[PDB]
Amino acid sequence: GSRKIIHVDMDCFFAAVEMRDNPALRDIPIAIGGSRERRGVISTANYPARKFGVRSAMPTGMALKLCPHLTLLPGRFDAYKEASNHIREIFSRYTSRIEPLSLDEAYLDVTDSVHCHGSATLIAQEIRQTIFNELQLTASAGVAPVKFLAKIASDMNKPNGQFVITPAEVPAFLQTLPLAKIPGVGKVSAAKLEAMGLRTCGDVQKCDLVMLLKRFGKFGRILWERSQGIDERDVNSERLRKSVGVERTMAEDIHHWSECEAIIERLYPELERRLAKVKPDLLIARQGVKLKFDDFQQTTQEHVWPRLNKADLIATARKTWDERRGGRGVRLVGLHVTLLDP
DNA sequence: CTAGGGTCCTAGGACCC
DNA sequence: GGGTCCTAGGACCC
Ligand SMILES: Cc1cn([C@H]2C[C@H](O)[C@@H](COP(=O)(O)OP(=O)(O)NP(=O)(O)O)O2)c(=O)[nH]c1=O
Ligand SMILES: [Mg+2]
Ligand SMILES: [Mg+2]
């Protein structure tokens, strides 16, 4: 009853696209990210930049201190999206069981594929090659009997590599695996687990399910399952986007509502333009706003509303501004929309 | 010195029976 | 007394 799941993952996806499109960035540390003055962070970076410690989600200010010759690129999301469409169409040549997770990665369920004599190892390789031959970018891949093990495996031979985990290899692979490597166990959860003596899946295997359920809820059940290789989630392939949001972080904290409203006026056309791509009639389920203050607390207020409407967003923003801001500076304003169900 | 695009889970009160 | 919706917040992913 064992299935074959491939996880494909582009190498330094945005950076790799920028070097293809301008070879001059090939051997210099580059990074896609807002400038220091724009208070931005690194989206991604190439390997000459991560040699210096540059990571995704790092404040640009901290990147430039580690890597003073970093080259900041603004990013060209149409170029990234075109490559994403291309790779996904490459996936289609092999199976329709494709669940994309972002521009640059997808799960594939190749169980009932008889490409490459049903070898998932050689299907994964034949996709990386091909991506290489047709897009001049590289991908890493992971092959395992379940989703999360396949995702972990795609980082172990990154860049331009892959890694296979057979069911017979699963128990030994699990035994020393830090919990934080499990997709969905982040920093906060890992630090709680660590603080009661749980670091690896082998640790959680010595744990009672009931206790984990009491301490963590459904997350505790997830944690006990994954700790044993149990991950029965199917590769979906028909997930649909449920929301679209637009938010902006100013270079300077705003302190006056005239500043906020002017920002909303620039945000709204963008949100409308993007909603129309997926809902021409702008018919929606809910709309709302987001403010992030200078103490980094953030708040949203949204409500049932039937159609993208600028004035109600301005209205509810003004309300949020007055009712919850306490004279703090505001670093970010965002608009939001929850899409209708079908 | 802390982005912007998202997803999913939780939790109290409203509302319903 | 038990479901289901509404909203806010937050952990987490890319
Ligand atoms: C994690 C992350 C990613 N991104 C963008 C930029 C990345 O190029 C793209 C793919 O995300 P990955 O996690 O796959 O990292 P990567 O750049 O492709 N490097 P890697 O996959 O080789 O580790 O998605 C961001 O903008 N912010 C992020 O935090
Ligand atoms: Mg990647
Ligand atoms: Mg990825």
Side-chain angles (χ1 to χ4, degrees), chain A residues 111-133:
Chain A
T111 305
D112 306 315
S113 200
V114 201
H115 279 276
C116 302
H117 324 264
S119 162
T121 287
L122 268 187
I123 288 178
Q125 195 107 236
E126 206 179 282
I127 292 179
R128 298 195 303 106
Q129 204 70 232
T130 307
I131 292 187
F132 192 174
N133 289 317

Side-chain angles (χ1 to χ4, degrees), chain A residues 42-64 66-205 207-293:
Chain A
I42 301 305
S43 259
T44 196
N46 65 3
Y47 276 112
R50 20 190 81 170
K51 184 184 52 199
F52 291 88
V54 181
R55 300 307 187 254
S56 271
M58 187 166 64
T60 288
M62 176 195 327
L64 281 165
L66 300 161
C67 179
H69 299 71
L70 190 53
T71 302
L72 251 67
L73 281 34
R76 297 145 53 239
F77 288 88
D78 271 15
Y80 312 151
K81 144 162 263 49
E82 171 172 58
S84 189
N85 289 358
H86 196 159
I87 73 171
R88 275 162 199 197
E89 183 274 316
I90 308 273
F91 303 158
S92 70
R93 297 172 204 174
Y94 284 90
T95 182
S96 63
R97 320 274 319 277
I98 304 170
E99 171 181 353
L101 304 156
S102 61
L103 291 181
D104 99 322
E105 68 180 59
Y107 286 116
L108 279 53
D109 183 337
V110 294
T111 305
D112 306 315
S113 200
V114 201
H115 279 276
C116 302
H117 324 264
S119 162
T121 287
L122 268 187
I123 288 178
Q125 195 107 236
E126 206 179 282
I127 292 179
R128 298 195 303 106
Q129 204 70 232
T130 307
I131 292 187
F132 192 174
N133 289 317
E134 304 193 2
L135 280 144
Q136 294 310 303
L137 314 152
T138 65
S140 290
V143 183
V146 298
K147 271 175 167 217
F148 89 101
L149 285 171
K151 166 135 203 175
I152 300 173
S154 61
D155 290 343
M156 322 218 60
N157 245 10
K158 194 169 262 283
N160 209 351
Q162 58 192 59
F163 185 78
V164 179
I165 307 185
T166 64
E169 307 167 58
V170 161
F173 184 78
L174 277 171
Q175 181 70 26
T176 65
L177 177 72
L179 299 168
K181 283 256 193 159
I182 297 170
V185 182
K187 193 270 164 201
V188 167
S189 290
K192 285 163 53 55
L193 297 165
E194 194 90 53
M196 51 192 190
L198 298 183
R199 192 183 67 77
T200 67
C201 297
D203 300 326
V204 181
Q205 295 171 10
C207 282
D208 159 50
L209 177 63
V210 179
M211 180 272 306
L212 292 170
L213 279 175
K214 265 150 55 201
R215 299 231 45 179
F216 293 120
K218 304 180 187 56
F219 185 75
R221 179 175 296 282
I222 290 302
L223 206 37
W224 181 94
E225 281 179 13
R226 307 293 182 268
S227 275
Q228 301 188 275
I230 297 174
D231 167 13
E232 275 143 352
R233 292 168 305 152
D234 193 37
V235 165
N236 200 319
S237 106
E238 38 206 82
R239 295 159 106 271
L240 298 170
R241 169 167 65 162
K242 298 175 187 213
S243 67
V244 14
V246 190
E247 55 195 59
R248 242 38 182 198
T249 278
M250 287 72 60
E252 316 279 356
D253 286 1
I254 59 177
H255 294 77
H256 312 288
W257 157 255
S258 61
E259 303 156 330
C260 188
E261 145 105 57
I263 290 160
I264 296 183
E265 288 274 342
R266 334 210 296 210
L267 259 21
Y268 182 86
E270 281 316 294
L271 167 61
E272 159 175 88
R273 165 189 151 271
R274 279 161 48 181
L275 180 53
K277 292 197 187 185
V278 157
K279 274 246 81 197
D281 54 14
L282 307 181
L283 293 190
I284 55 169
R286 311 165 81 245
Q287 72 169 14
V289 301
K290 183 182 188 162
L291 304 184
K292 190 194 278 185
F293 311 111

Side-chain angles (χ1 to χ4, degrees), chain A residues 9-13 104-105 158:
Chain A
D9 194 309
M10 299 308 286
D11 303 309
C12 303
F13 181 41
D104 99 322
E105 68 180 59
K158 194 169 262 283

